[PDB]
């Protein structure tokens, strides 16, 4: 429970304006219809975004911090899987993931 509160604080900093320049592509779900990504649902079977993770934290859907971190890493894996390696959104994903992994590892135990 106390580590779940840390997961909410980690996601809060991931939403903070300090990281917005590279974290914004992951704020909301990938709208496959509006963005014209007509192959996304064939490649990505389990989409995930920061807003969905936030709603699952508010609904207390995550049992522990490890399940929360799995959804965060699923969001990044979807980006690494769908986009080319040299794509600009891949570099932005590594930036935000480095912020997550550091704070997720530094979580009080």
């Amino acid at each position: 429970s106390e580590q779940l509160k840390c997961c909410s604080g980690i996601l809060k900093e991931m939403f903070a304006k300090k990281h917005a320049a590279y974290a914004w592509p992951f704020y909301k779900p990938v709208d496959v219809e509006a963005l014209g990504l007509h192959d996304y649902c064939d490649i990505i079977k389990h989409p995930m975004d920061m807003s969905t993770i936030k709603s699952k934290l508010e609904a207390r859907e995550y049992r522990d911090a490890q399940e929360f971190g799995a959804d965060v890493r699923l969001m990044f894996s979807n980006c690494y899987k769908y986009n080319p390696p040299d794509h600009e959104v891949v570099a932005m994903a590594r930036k935000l993931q480095d912020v997550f992994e550091m704070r997720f590892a530094k979580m009080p135990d």
Binding site: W24, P25, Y27, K28, V30, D31, A34, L35, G36, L37, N83, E88, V89
Partner: peptide, 12 residues
């Protein structure tokens, strides 16, 4: 100006 517009221009 929206998230969707920026998102669209970033991917494509």
């Amino acid at each position: 100006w929206s998230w969707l517009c920026k998102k669209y221009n970033l991917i494509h």
